[PDB]
Design a protein around this ligand. Structure first.
Ligand SMILES: *[C@@H]1O[C@H](CO)[C@@H](O)[C@H](O)[C@H]1NC(C)=O
Lengths: 210, 210
């Protein structure tokens, strides 16, 4: 049923928030795999083969929390790992989960904006780094944190996501062009809602918290 | 595609309507979601069920279904020696074919639910809930359906027949197993998608070319 994140209490974030961030990632990955519209400029990418479902990593979440928690200008961002950072203006009437739902899409918007009609979106360049982190077919783990920071420049919502694996470099293949639901990179693969997955990953994510 | 013989004289579009219907009912039961778009009434919400697996088409059952309805006689040559469902709908002058085909199988659900008492165990067979029981039978995964407009002297009807694999259900037989949605362990290499169990073998098989 509901997702087992099983993260330590001291991370001080709700599973509902974790779910928003993780569902966001898989939604982007699924849109690319199925060549479906991303935002409600170029807005359709893919299709892609071997685009697999991401799972949470509580250690990556802790890294993300550490990068934003001091609320300093600038933040102690760890550029030695793949990560995305976003900041969102808060208004009097701002509702937290709406903010958390909307904020990450800014990474998709920023990246798409830099796509020219001729740009190979599946190939990395610095102008599309945030989307590339999200759609990296080689990375299956993510952890994100959020915080209302009172910076000297004013109060904002800050979101950081840290990713498994390596920082992408120039001209790396971010994802592989191919048919939706072609899933053969891993043993015992299946496809659900246009996103590849494996029995091993499903079995692991459904283990009870301990 | 469904790869069924040309002489069955039915489109894959109709086959998908019938197949999707069956798996919609099964997924509602598996996931304890409302069956009819009607969600105050608890007799409209059955389940959850464990080991409810996705159904697949069978061209030979379709042939048996077609044979039961094609002559348009009164009575029809229904073969009660196998599990089957029959639906007849008196057409109106502006009825559209595929719209009726999408609607009429639901009468099997509505008719069975109509016979549930508040304390009735809906996973336990009795003839009053036979049509729903055929659809939701966990021990059968094959279905084949046909449709035809018959000019009976008593009026022109859309007629739909679905034939099912396996045995005719008997009084007090367990139709499906009460248990957690997405617990799928009746077969090796199982997975769950949209609240419905499936296997890698069954996915591979249905995705083969004719
Ligand atoms: C956890 O987060 C809330 C803000 O959402 C904060 O007010 C609270 O003090 C935090 N708890 C700790 C121990 O940091």
């Amino acid at each position: 049923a509901e997702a087992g994140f099983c993260c330590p209490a001291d991370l001080n974030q709700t599973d509902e928030a974790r779910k928003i961030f993780l569902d966001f990632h898989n939604q982007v990955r699924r849109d690319i795999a199925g060549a479906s519209p991303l935002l409600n400029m170029r807005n359709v990418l893919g299709p892609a083969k071997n685009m697999y479902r991401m799972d949470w990593d509580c250690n990556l979440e802790a890294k993300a929390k550490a990068m934003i928690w001091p609320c300093t200008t600038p933040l102690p961002i760890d550029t030695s790992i793949p990560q995305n950072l976003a900041q969102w203006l808060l208004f009097q009437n701002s509702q937290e989960n709406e903010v958390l739902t909307q904020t990450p899409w800014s990474w998709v918007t920023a990246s798409l904006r830099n796509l020219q009609p001729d740009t190979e979106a599946n190939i990395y360049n610095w102008q599309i780094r945030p989307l590339s982190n999200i759609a990296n077919w080689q990375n299956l783990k993510v952890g994100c944190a959020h915080k209302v920071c009172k910076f000297p420049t004013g109060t904002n919502m800050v979101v950081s996501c840290a990713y498994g694996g390596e920082v992408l470099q120039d001209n790396e293949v971010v994802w592989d062009k191919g048919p939706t639901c072609m899933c053969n990179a891993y043993p015992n693969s299946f496809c659900c809602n246009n996103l590849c997955d494996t029995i091993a990953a499903a079995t692991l994510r459904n283990q009870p918290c301990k």
